[PDB]
């Protein structure tokens, strides 16, 4: 499923970042980087979920998880 972040998708993200040319090895590095980031955020969001005695991760939980990692998110209710 990690391959679902397709090569064209990674290219499009880089273009938004102002990247003009992309080396052929970048795609594998980005996938690895994304894996690390996602694990951290999801870990915290799931941790909050267990504390709330809930079985469904809510957007607010993610927002809280993002705040503690210094990646405050605006737009999902706080």
């Amino acid at each position: 499923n990690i391959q679902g972040i397709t090569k064209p998708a990674i290219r499009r993200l880089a273009r938004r970042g102002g990247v003009k040319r992309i080396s052929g090895l970048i795609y594998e590095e980005t996938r690895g980087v994304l894996k690390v980031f996602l694990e951290n955020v999801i870990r915290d969001a799931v941790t909050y979920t267990e504390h709330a005695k809930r079985k469904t991760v809510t957007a607010m939980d993610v927002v809280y998880a993002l705040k503690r990692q210094g990646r405050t998110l605006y737009g999902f209710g706080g």
Binding site: I5, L13, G17, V19, K20, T56, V57, G75
Partner: protein, 95 residues
């Protein structure tokens, strides 16, 4: 008519920097979330808005990284970002 290598690249920057839609396919991202979440707790559900919140953060984070990676590449008098450039960006940020 054939555009010279690089001409189309500048056009994509302008188009995607002008647009705001999410650029990673939704379903692939959703499948990714569920596989990762499986390792922490089984049969974990996610509100549709929860997945959206993750994607917004993830894209913004990656955009931020590619921007910094580019500066590193430019710094070495290159225009191509390479794995060594990403590593440097991450190292400086403390990751």
């Amino acid at each position: 008519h054939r555009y010279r290598p690089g001409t189309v690249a500048l056009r994509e920057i302008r188009r995607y920097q002008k647009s705001t839609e999410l650029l990673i396919r939704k379903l692939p991202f959703q499948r990714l979330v569920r596989e990762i979440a499986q390792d922490f707790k089984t049969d974990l559900r996610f509100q549709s808005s929860a997945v959206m919140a993750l994607q917004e953060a993830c894209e913004a984070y990656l955009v931020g990284l590619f921007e910094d990676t580019n500066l590193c590449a430019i710094h070495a008098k290159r225009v191509t970002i390479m794995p060594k450039d990403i590593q440097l960006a991450r190292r400086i940020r403390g990751e």
